Design a protein around this ligand. Sequence first.
Ligand SMILES: [Cl-]
Ligand SMILES: [K+]
Ligand SMILES: [K+]
Length: 69
Amino acid sequence: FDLNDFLEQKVLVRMEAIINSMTMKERAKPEIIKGSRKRRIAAGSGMQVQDVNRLLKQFDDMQRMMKKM
RNA sequence: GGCUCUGUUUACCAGGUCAGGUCCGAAAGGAAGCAGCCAAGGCAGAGCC
Ligand SMILES: [Cl-]
Ligand SMILES: [K+]
Ligand SMILES: [K+]
């Protein structure tokens, strides 16, 4: 389960925007998204770093639920 | 070495464009700009000088 699958799942549009700012490698392997990548994605989606942190955490909550079932 | 062709490769960190999204504006309209793409660079093979 990756961010390409989470994309297919005003608040919903803003979340899709953050993923639209990522590279295919970032969508395929979300763990590589550290500080510098979060800043590029944030500014690129017109959001703040906190909004990227929230989206990545919401993905991690979903990924951990998919790993349980 | 140079030029060109071809393959491939490259998140941001002074190229272009810019879906999505963002910012300014009551509007009309403006602005910046990620990803992608183009271009460019990297690694090579080849042809020519
Ligand atoms: Cl080349
Ligand atoms: K761009
Ligand atoms: K650009």
